[PDB]
Amino acid sequence: IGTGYDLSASTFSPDGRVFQVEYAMKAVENSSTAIGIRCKDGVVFGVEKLVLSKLYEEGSNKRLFNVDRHVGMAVAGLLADARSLADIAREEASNFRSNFGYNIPLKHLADRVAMYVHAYTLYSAVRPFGCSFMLGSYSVNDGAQLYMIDPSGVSYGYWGCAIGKARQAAKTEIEKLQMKEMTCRDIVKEVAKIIYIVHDEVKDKAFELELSWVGELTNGRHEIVPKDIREEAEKYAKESLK
Amino acid sequence: NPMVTGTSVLGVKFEGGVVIAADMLGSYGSLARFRNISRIMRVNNSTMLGASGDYADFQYLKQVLGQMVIDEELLGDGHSYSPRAIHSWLTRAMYSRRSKMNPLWNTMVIGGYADGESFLGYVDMLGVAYEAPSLATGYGAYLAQPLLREVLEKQPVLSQTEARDLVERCMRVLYYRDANRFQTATVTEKGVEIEGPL
Amino acid sequence: ERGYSFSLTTFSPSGKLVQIEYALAAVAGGAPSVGIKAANGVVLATEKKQKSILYDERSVHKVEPITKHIGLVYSGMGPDYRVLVHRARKLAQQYYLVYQEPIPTAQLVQRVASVMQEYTQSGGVRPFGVSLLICGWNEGRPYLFQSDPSGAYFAWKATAMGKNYVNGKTFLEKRYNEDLELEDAIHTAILTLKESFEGQMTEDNIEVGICNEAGFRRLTPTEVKDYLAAIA
Amino acid sequence: MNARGLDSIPVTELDLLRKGFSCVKNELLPSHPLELSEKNFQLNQDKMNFSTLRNIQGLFAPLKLQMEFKAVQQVQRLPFLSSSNLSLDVLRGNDETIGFEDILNDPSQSEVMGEPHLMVEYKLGLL
Amino acid sequence: STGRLPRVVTANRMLKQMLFRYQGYIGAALVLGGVDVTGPHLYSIYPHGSTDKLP
Amino acid sequence: FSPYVFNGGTILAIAGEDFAIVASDTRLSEGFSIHTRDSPKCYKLTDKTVIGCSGFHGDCLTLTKIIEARLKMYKHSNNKAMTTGAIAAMLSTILYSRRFFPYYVYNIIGGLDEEGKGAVYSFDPVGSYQRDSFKAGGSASAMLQPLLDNQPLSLDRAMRLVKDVFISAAERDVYTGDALRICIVTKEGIREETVSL
Amino acid sequence: MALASVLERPLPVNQRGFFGLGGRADLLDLGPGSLSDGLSLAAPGIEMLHGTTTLAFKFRHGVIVAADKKVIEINPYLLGTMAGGAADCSFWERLLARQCRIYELRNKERISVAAASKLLANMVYQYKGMGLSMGTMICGWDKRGPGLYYVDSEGNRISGATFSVGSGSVYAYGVMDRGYSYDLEVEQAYDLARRAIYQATVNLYHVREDGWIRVS
Amino acid sequence: AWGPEAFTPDWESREVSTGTTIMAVQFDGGVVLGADSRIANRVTDKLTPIHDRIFCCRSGSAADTQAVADAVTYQLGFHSIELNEPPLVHTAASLFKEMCYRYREDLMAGIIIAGWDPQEGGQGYSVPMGGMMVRQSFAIGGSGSSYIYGYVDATYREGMTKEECLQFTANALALAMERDSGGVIRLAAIAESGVERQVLLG
Amino acid sequence: SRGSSAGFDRHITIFSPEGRLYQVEYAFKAINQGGLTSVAVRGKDCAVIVTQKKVPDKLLDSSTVTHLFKITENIGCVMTGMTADSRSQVQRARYEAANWKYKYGYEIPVDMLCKRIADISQVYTQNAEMRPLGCCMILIGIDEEQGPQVYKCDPAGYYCGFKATAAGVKQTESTSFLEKKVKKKFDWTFEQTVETAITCLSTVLSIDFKPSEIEVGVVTVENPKFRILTEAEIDAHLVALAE
Amino acid sequence: MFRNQYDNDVTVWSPQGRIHQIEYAMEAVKQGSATVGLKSKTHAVLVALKRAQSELAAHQKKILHVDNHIGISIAGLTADARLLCNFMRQECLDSRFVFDRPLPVSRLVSLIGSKTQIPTQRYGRRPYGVGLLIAGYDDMGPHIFQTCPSANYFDCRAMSIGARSQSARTYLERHMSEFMECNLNELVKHGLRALRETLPAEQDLTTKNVSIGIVGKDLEFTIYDDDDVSPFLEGLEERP
Amino acid sequence: AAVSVYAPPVGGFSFDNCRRNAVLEADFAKRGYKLPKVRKTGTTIAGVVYKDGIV
Incomplete structure (x- = not known):
């Protein structure tokens, strides 16, 4: 109960809480589920993308962006805020490369974007962001890395993450994987299977699977999964459902 | 305040693309000790750039142009900069900098091969731009332009080997004028290939 | 009515400002402090909030010097006290640079009060919740001033402020003399501080500073202990 | 390095008693090499700090600093009176240093001052 | 503010930055010397803002 | 550092009862060296007006681009294409906008008017303009104007005159090109052809 | 980009493409603009009227101005003359005509000669020493009778019954000084103006109650 | 004219130079930075430490170079604390180049940077007047840059021992200094184990 | 700004009738939201910082979860409250x-x-x-003329120097324990300071600690640079304490 | 009942994590009239339905002109439409001036979304209450884009917005498989038949209440009004 | 109140008499007059660092 102290981002509840940030975090659970799994030699993403109508193209309103040559990104929540944060991340990476002449480390980029997100929960002239996102990268001298940022502005490193409406079941399914000793080719199928298991068809008419990895196979580049591998993963997931 | 000339840059057009040769020498003034530096840039798969003049401005423009190319290829919507777009952007940048009496001391040559047609442009620090079958800027600008012009006038259509031989002999004549190393770049359907130093 | 108790820039129908009264109430709820002007010096005494063994004696002090001949003590909030101390030091240095002579006490009090007045007339801020006592010595004549959160200053001969200050004021009225000396003034200050004290006073829970023709000096704990043992 | 800093002749197609004794030719160029440098010292210092902070840490730091400056510089006196600039000096870091702007030509004792309403209107942007 | 005696390097830095700010139009060549916790020090400042440490 | 460079050129314009002719050479040079032998100096603005400019090349390019942008702006705002007189007035204002740092360009505008007759306007690097019947500009204007003055006509005789004037002027000038371009503005549109020199 | 919009002061640091002390910031805005009007700051052949002679005097029935075009028709009721830089004269007198039309529309009454001359002098005085060169005589008729003023680029503004500027100024001025008379008929005034301009070495205007006319 | 021939401002000859001579030579394990002495002085240190393993030498105006060095030390320390790692020589060279290029019309500054990092070993960069940034095996600047360039170029060989590199640098600096002066030559060898400074006199 | 809320409790620039600000007190209450506790002890020639380390998930990366930072090369830090x-x-x-x-x-x-x-x-x-x-x-650090230093600041803007301080949920109990220890005796070596700092938290939380549940940072006169101890050294200290 | 406190500004989150003012602004699109936009392998077509205040007033125009290869259609407020049109025109003009190339539609719509997102986060502003349909042509062929007051844009193959556009959307979905082979004729006819489903069953389409905009491979953006629409209306059927 | 003041004034150095003095000095030198000069100090100074202090 925080009635009366929840109309601005610069007001403290009598027990020391800010409720606008809590409402913003609650707003993320209104969208579909996106997961990301870090493995021995790469990072692979997967998004359950709902279909609104058949009048839209194949690549409309995607949820997987290319922040840089070596960094991927997956979002959840309000889409416009996701586009704005993607633009911010691109600008930060470009500025670092221009200043210092080499690719920006993932931890530094995560810190920059997390601080930019946190700056919005301090003043009464703006409102907190309403989206979470994950970042993934790979390099020969550092290895795979994965991070999450939430509307409050807190970032952490993960071995496997899940954001959206059904993060609990997705986390339960992920916690049964030995991702430390497998390979991206063996993780794409698991990601597809988890996405298919989590999806609920009663309240959601249809969906399209979206996948992309980064790692040693792509030579340190973030790319979309080829169509044949997507088809094979979908077929395996459908067979495993039975 | 004192002024000195710049290194020589050559360029010709042949059937499949363009050939550009540049000098490896640092500068003709007191900076002669900075030898063995490259002046040829690869912009994208169908554009290459050669420079003659100040080196710091060349590096600055290299940074800006590379960042722009990376930014456009990140989106992946299927659109890329043509050689003419780079030519126009360079001309506008030079003119805008000149109008403020803080010019960029350079003289660029742009070559490319898009849509089956070759390109060859010229931009200087004052904003003067045009296109010609052959170009030559630098120390021997007036001793090499008429030669290439008449050679191309005799034969409007030239092959790759003939153009390369003509460039080599022009560079040899220029060195014989005053007494070492250079490099050559080519743009064709395959892409931008740089060979050097020689 | 509570309709005029929230905003700083609103006059009550009776012609009163309420937030300034509340700031004064905040001042009147801090630790006690006493100032007495003797015939050849001024003494300032106060309590300290630490009262513990984990505190480091060299860290933070309540009696602070502005110039060679000016010092002050406060009662109220501490964070609001630090900024005012810094501004006072800067103003004194500016005056010395311009006029090549140390600043008189009255001018410093006037300028500090002028700074404090600005925060009681604009919407979007709050008044300072602190009150100040300034002592000095100019032309062979001691001075003692007090500055309110409103920006109004008075010249005093003996005053008390903080917790239980009405009883301190009447105690001082009963036992003040115009022909005192520095030692008698110090004894009276210690006694009137002990009047409102609750625990056992030692040399580790009070601060004393004096100002005579030599300059402004803060007494060491050994001297405070010696003075305390004198009166038992 | 903080002191080193790095076609506006409109024609009315978008009172002469108020403004006078000024020509474009004289104000085309400065009278001394140190004039513009001294007039714009604080702006140049703020720009340098913002540049280095943005290059090292990110966008959030200069934005937060500018937001704090704007918020704290809105509770001042009206322009025809002199303010103290306490919290702005604290935030900016100039609360323990004295420069040549403080001991020379005290702004609190200026020899000229205009009408109140005129200054308040000019600050608001109406005039 | 700091509660302890200052250092020579602080005065040297302040003087150097001032003289460099005013572009050498303020003609003042100085010889600065003192002793602090680190030890004795001696400097040499010039009107254009260039210092130099010598014995 | 001189921000001005002179480049050769020569332009001409003849106004008729129902036609207008604009012609120019096609050489770019810097006094001694020859940049290109193919660079026309006549630009088509609308279906009924043509502009020809010579002088410093960068200023010419910037002026043409600004003129085209302003034409597009006017078409969007007023829902119609702007006429020759409006173009002349706008160009005069644009030129005078830089009185204290002028464009080093000489312009000549030719086209049809509202009533359907030829119109020719001549400018100066500051912006003064007036309507004429025939005008010659460029480097060789001084040695070409008396010939035209001592020598309205029909289209064919005017073309014959233009050809002989340029063939006589090219042999005596060091900036004339190796080709001549003529643009004809009539009621059915605009057509142009190149004559070797 | 909502936090940066609140700060109503766009700095180059807040924009895109910023690195180092500068960056790709001065090379971003290269458009042709939207709408404005303003002369450029200070850093070829400029047409100037050299061999021109003008003449103007006022009498009972109006003002007669003659010259050897070289006379600007500002309004149906106002007349002007150029001397020096043609472009400057044309531009500033166009501005004066626009100002007069604005005044008439606002106040529903025609402007006077004195006000127009003062406006022109005020406009041309701001750029003293920049390089402008112009000399103008302004003719008209208002509620106070005929008027005649002389305005130049040096700030001079004088009123008189007889003026002359040009190469043959001395001879023509002497002739029309010898032959001047306030109570003069229109025909004799025409003859005097023609004789003066002839001896100076032909246009001729005449301002009346209801606008100027052309004689020859 | 100036258009097709691409004339250059020629920064290095704006004013005549009669300063000291500075040199940096790369050997196998690191880099050796040295400077000579050639009025008053003779007890002055000409080597300015930027970090624990990064040094620099200055040429041109004293005040401008000192201000640039102070600002660069600021920025490098802040960046190293932020990234939580020892700095790279390339970063320091870029930081110098930015201000040396933006203020080319106001300051007369020429910087040479030498140092060691665990990623690429001993490196030496040259940032002369104008803003150029080039890495070189051996870098020469100052007054003898024209007098000793041929000898240094002819004699220099590939990576040698630290002692041999020190001897070669000392010989080159002595030949540069005795052009026709002073007697004090300062050297510094930078390696992984740490800097090792020494002074040669007499 | 969208205005100021009305009430003696809902804004920062409004004084209560008794003369006290409540938003500052609520900010003070916000410190205990994390659920962790920190203890700092100053020795004769050293200063030690000890704090908890809670890793609830199993998919989390424990290397990226920390609360000890580094301001400069010779100044440490530890934070309590909102991350x-x-x-x-x-x-x-x-x-x-x-x-x-x-x-x-x-x-x-x-x-x-x-x-x-x-x-x-x-x-x-x-x-x-x-x-x-x-x-x-x-903050902890070492001065030139003076030895180790321990300092603390709070959201109200009040700072002071201490001999042994604490912050978090168990601040009162930690303060009482440290007061008893300091009153008993203060002459401590490097080993004794770490031992008492660990013992205070152990006896207040009633938990037998493990090497992966705490993190320690020390500053000593011999090596004045901030250093974060490793799991092996923490385990060695714990074993010595147990024995 | 409990919503009265959290639906007065765009800077306040509801206890359910919803911004009610954005949802309120999204309802202004349904206050206009129906618009239909579709595309084929070569051409892109916009069809709009015009309303009039009375019999003595001209019908309000809905289809505007942005560049030689881009055109837009409006449904919602009017001031916001004018402001957005000005922004579009300025961006296209600047791109053409600088690069001597047409501005890609994808980049243009991304700029629109980036500009529109801002007033939904800061105080003292309101969201744009207008929805647009964009038809263009570039190196990738024809394009149809849709814009929303919530700063969201989609890449469509056939879309309808306005009042009572559900029938048009249903018709387009049913007849989606034949659009990519039709030439300009029968494509304008499919668009007109789709637009005719938004009307009552008694009345039909005349020449004074329809506007057509076409852009193609070698045909610039053109608008057909009044008597120019008769050739397209000749072949329609009797509303089956 | 002055009718020609729009913004509050500031402090620091003043450059009002720059051009006036610039032309006045040239005129006075041309006609051969004298103007007040600036006092200067040129006496020798020195310093040294001994064992535990500065002289």
Whole structure:
């Protein structure tokens, strides 16, 4: 109960809480589920993308962006805020490369974007962001890395993450994987299977699977999964459902 | 305040693309000790750039142009900069900098091969731009332009080997004028290939 | 009515400002402090909030010097006290640079009060919740001033402020003399501080500073202990 | 390095008693090499700090600093009176240093001052 | 503010930055010397803002 | 550092009862060296007006681009294409906008008017303009104007005159090109052809 | 980009493409603009009227101005003359005509000669020493009778019954000084103006109650 | 004219130079930075430490170079604390180049940077007047840059021992200094184990 | 700004009838939201910081979860409260230290850094646009003439120097335990300081600790650079304490 | 009942994590009239339905002109439409001036979304209450884009917005498989038949209440009004 | 109140008499007059660092 102290981002509840940030975090659970799994030699993403109508193209309103040559990104929540944060991340990476002449480390980029997100929960002239996102990268001298940022502005490193409406079941399914000793080719199928298991068809008419990895196979580049591998993963997931 | 000339840059057009040769020498003034530096840039798969003049401005423009190319290829919507777009952007940048009496001391040559047609442009620090079958800027600008012009006038259509031989002999004549190393770049359907130093 | 108790820039129908009264109430709820002007010096005494063994004696002090001949003590909030101390030091240095002579006490009090007045007339801020006592010595004549959160200053001969200050004021009225000396003034200050004290006073829970023709000096704990043992 | 800093002749197609004794030719160029440098010292210092902070840490730091400056510089006196600039000096870091702007030509004792309403209107942007 | 005696390097830095700010139009060549916790020090400042440490 | 460079050129314009002719050479040079032998100096603005400019090349390019942008702006705002007189007035204002740092360009505008007759306007690097019947500009204007003055006509005789004037002027000038371009503005549109020199 | 919009002061640091002390910031805005009007700051052949002679005097029935075009028709009721830089004269007198039309529309009454001359002098005085060169005589008729003023680029503004500027100024001025008379008929005034301009070495205007006319 | 021939401002000859001579030579394990002495002085240190393993030498105006060095030390320390790692020589060279290029019309500054990092070993960069940034095996600047360039170029060989590199640098600096002066030559060898400074006199 | 809420409780620039600000007290209450506790002890020639380390998930990366930061090469830190606010204040402190070093030519002292942070934090209490940060900062370091130093600042803008302080949920019990220990005796070596710092937390939380459940940072006179101890050394200290 | 406190500004989150003012602004699109936009392998077509205040007033225009290869259609407020049109025109003009190339539609719509997102986060502003349909042509062929007051844009193959556009959307979905082979004729006819489903069953389409905009491979953006629409209306059927 | 003041004034150095003095000095030198000069100090100074202090 925080009635009366929840109309601005610069007001403290009598027990020391800010409720606008809590409402913003609650707003993320209104969208579909996106997961990301870090493995021995790469990072692979997967998004359950709902279909609104058949009048839209194949690549409309995607949820997987290319922040840089070596960094991927997956979002959840309000889409416009996701586009704005993607633009911010691109600008930060470009500025670092221009200043210092080499690719920006993932931890530094995560810190920059997390601080930019946190700056919005301090003043009464703006409102907190309403989206979470994950970042993934790979390099020969550092290895795979994965991070999450939430509307409050807190970032952490993960071995496997899940954001959206059904993060609990997705986390339960992920916690049964030995991702430390497998390979991206063996993780794409698991990601597809988890996405298919989590999806609920009663309240959601249809969906399209979206996948992309980064790692040693792509030579340190973030790319979309080829169509044949997507088809094979979908077929395996459908067979495993039975 | 004192002024000195710049290194020589050559360029010709042949059937499949363009050939550009540049000098490896640092500068003709007191900076002669900075030898063995490259002046040829690869912009994208169908554009290459050669420079003659100040080196710091060349590096600055290299940074800006590379960042722009990376930014456009990140989106992946299927659109890329043509050689003419780079030519126009360079001309506008030079003119805008000149109008403020803080010019960029350079003289660029742009070559490319898009849509089956070759390109060859010229931009200087004052904003003067045009296109010609052959170009030559630098120390021997007036001793090499008429030669290439008449050679191309005799034969409007030239092959790759003939153009390369003509460039080599022009560079040899220029060195014989005053007494070492250079490099050559080519743009064709395959892409931008740089060979050097020689 | 509570309709005029929230905003700083609103006059009550009776012609009163309420937030300034509340700031004064905040001042009147801090630790006690006493100032007495003797015939050849001024003494300032106060309590300290630490009262513990984990505190480091060299860290933070309540009696602070502005110039060679000016010092002050406060009662109220501490964070609001630090900024005012810094501004006072800067103003004194500016005056010395311009006029090549140390600043008189009255001018410093006037300028500090002028700074404090600005925060009681604009919407979007709050008044300072602190009150100040300034002592000095100019032309062979001691001075003692007090500055309110409103920006109004008075010249005093003996005053008390903080917790239980009405009883301190009447105690001082009963036992003040115009022909005192520095030692008698110090004894009276210690006694009137002990009047409102609750625990056992030692040399580790009070601060004393004096100002005579030599300059402004803060007494060491050994001297405070010696003075305390004198009166038992 | 903080002191080193790095076609506006409109024609009315978008009172002469108020403004006078000024020509474009004289104000085309400065009278001394140190004039513009001294007039714009604080702006140049703020720009340098913002540049280095943005290059090292990110966008959030200069934005937060500018937001704090704007918020704290809105509770001042009206322009025809002199303010103290306490919290702005604290935030900016100039609360323990004295420069040549403080001991020379005290702004609190200026020899000229205009009408109140005129200054308040000019600050608001109406005039 | 700091509660302890200052250092020579602080005065040297302040003087150097001032003289460099005013572009050498303020003609003042100085010889600065003192002793602090680190030890004795001696400097040499010039009107254009260039210092130099010598014995 | 001189921000001005002179480049050769020569332009001409003849106004008729129902036609207008604009012609120019096609050489770019810097006094001694020859940049290109193919660079026309006549630009088509609308279906009924043509502009020809010579002088410093960068200023010419910037002026043409600004003129085209302003034409597009006017078409969007007023829902119609702007006429020759409006173009002349706008160009005069644009030129005078830089009185204290002028464009080093000489312009000549030719086209049809509202009533359907030829119109020719001549400018100066500051912006003064007036309507004429025939005008010659460029480097060789001084040695070409008396010939035209001592020598309205029909289209064919005017073309014959233009050809002989340029063939006589090219042999005596060091900036004339190796080709001549003529643009004809009539009621059915605009057509142009190149004559070797 | 909502936090940066609140700060109503766009700095180059807040924009895109910023690195180092500068960056790709001065090379971003290269458009042709939207709408404005303003002369450029200070850093070829400029047409100037050299061999021109003008003449103007006022009498009972109006003002007669003659010259050897070289006379600007500002309004149906106002007349002007150029001397020096043609472009400057044309531009500033166009501005004066626009100002007069604005005044008439606002106040529903025609402007006077004195006000127009003062406006022109005020406009041309701001750029003293920049390089402008112009000399103008302004003719008209208002509620106070005929008027005649002389305005130049040096700030001079004088009123008189007889003026002359040009190469043959001395001879023509002497002739029309010898032959001047306030109570003069229109025909004799025409003859005097023609004789003066002839001896100076032909246009001729005449301002009346209801606008100027052309004689020859 | 100036258009097709691409004339250059020629920064290095704006004013005549009669300063000291500075040199940096790369050997196998690191880099050796040295400077000579050639009025008053003779007890002055000409080597300015930027970090624990990064040094620099200055040429041109004293005040401008000192201000640039102070600002660069600021920025490098802040960046190293932020990234939580020892700095790279390339970063320091870029930081110098930015201000040396933006203020080319106001300051007369020429910087040479030498140092060691665990990623690429001993490196030496040259940032002369104008803003150029080039890495070189051996870098020469100052007054003898024209007098000793041929000898240094002819004699220099590939990576040698630290002692041999020190001897070669000392010989080159002595030949540069005795052009026709002073007697004090300062050297510094930078390696992984740490800097090792020494002074040669007499 | 969208106005100020009405009430003696709902804004930062409104005094209560009894003369007290309540938003500052609520910011103080916001420190206990994390659920962790920190203890700092000063020795004869050393200073030690001890804090908890809770890793609830199993998919988390334990290497990226920490609360000990580093301001300069010779100043440590530890934060309690909201994570994002703690990180933002750490960044501000780093910037202030760098600026002081550039402006004055030598390293900033611990008390000067704490005073600067407190002075900045006081401004948020006197303006209607900004709000206090819900965290507290503890710094350790070594002075030249004086030995070790321990300092603490709070959201209200008040700072002080201590001999042994604590912060978090169990602040009162930790303070009582440290008071008893200090009153008993204060002459401690390097080994004794770490032992008593660990013992205080152990006996207050009633938990037998494990090497992966705490993190320790020390500063000593011999090596004045901030150093974070490893799991092996923490386990060695725990074994010595148990024996 | 409990919503009265959290639906007065765009800077306030509801206890369910919803911004009610954005949802309120999204309802202004349904206050206009129906618009239909479709595309084929070569051409892109916009069809709009015009309303009039009375019999003595001209019908309000809905289809505007942005560049030689881009055109837009409006449904919602009017001031916001004018402001957005000005922004579009300025961006296209600047791109053409600088690069001597047409501005890609994808980049243009991304700029629109980036500009529109801002007033939904800061105080003292309101969201744009207008929805647009964009038809263009570039190196990738024809394009149809849709814009929303919530700063969201989609890449469509056939879309309808306005009042009572559900029938048009249903018709387009049913007849989606034949659009990519039709030439300009029968494509304008499919668009007109789709637009005719938004009307009552008694009345039909005349020449004074329809506007057509076409852009193609070698045909610039053109608008057909009044008597220019008769050739397209000749072949329609009797509303089956 | 003055009718020609729009913004509050500031402090620091003043450059009002720059051009006036610039032409006045040239005129006075041309006609051969004298103007007040600036006092200067040129006496020798020195310093040294001994064992535990500065002289």
